[PDB]
Amino acid sequence: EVLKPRTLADLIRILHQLFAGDEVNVEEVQAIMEAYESDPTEWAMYAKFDQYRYTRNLVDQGNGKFNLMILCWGEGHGSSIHDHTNSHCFLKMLQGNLKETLFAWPDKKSNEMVKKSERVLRENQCAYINDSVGLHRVENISHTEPAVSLHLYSPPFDTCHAFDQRTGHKNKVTMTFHSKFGIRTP
Numbered sequence: 001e002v003l004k005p006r007t008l009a010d011l012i013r014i015l016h017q018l019f020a021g022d023e024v025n026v027e028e029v030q031a032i033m034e035a036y037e038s039d040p041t042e043w044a045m046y047a048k049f050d051q052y053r054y055t056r057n058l059v060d061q062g063n064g065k066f067n068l069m070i071l072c073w074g075e076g077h078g079s080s081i082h083d084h085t086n087s088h089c090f091l092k093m094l095q096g097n098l099k100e101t102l103f104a105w106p107d108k109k110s111n112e113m114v115k116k117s118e119r120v121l122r123e124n125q126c127a128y129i130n131d132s133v134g135l136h137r138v139e140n141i142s143h144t145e146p147a148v149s150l151h152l153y154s155p156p157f158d159t160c161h162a163f164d165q166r167t168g169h170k171n172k173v174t175m176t177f178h179s180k181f182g183i184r185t186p
């Protein structure tokens, strides 16, 4: 009874419908994203890697309702601990595996940050986060194989905060795209 997209194109079309209105059913979106069976032939044109850091590759702008992007994680690549600027955030595995560590929000005093959950995202799994759930870090579990993930953020946002695990202190970070629609950016 979960609508199953047969292609990434199908999934994008469904997402346009599901985010067209004022309400978004998080569990419905998550189930449909998870139901799409990752097919590298369909997303290889977005899978542009970098030697030193993960890359952000824009796929679709969702008629202004969301950003859909593919993140390419080289061997051992991981993110900072970060927030999500008051948006819905869906993360689906396309290749490999990411470990997601959920963190509590710091208070004003400097302190080591507190882990609230730790898990590995499985093949084709779609996870969900927003600022009320917590902060998180994601990282490629493998030092010999890449990981690829599909991220949907709604509403779109271009900045977030990164947090220092030792103190809780944060810095504003402007997100940049490595490519858009399969075309490398300057």
Ligand SMILES: [Fe+2]
Binding pocket: 082, 083, 084, 089, 136
């Ligand atoms: Fe995130």
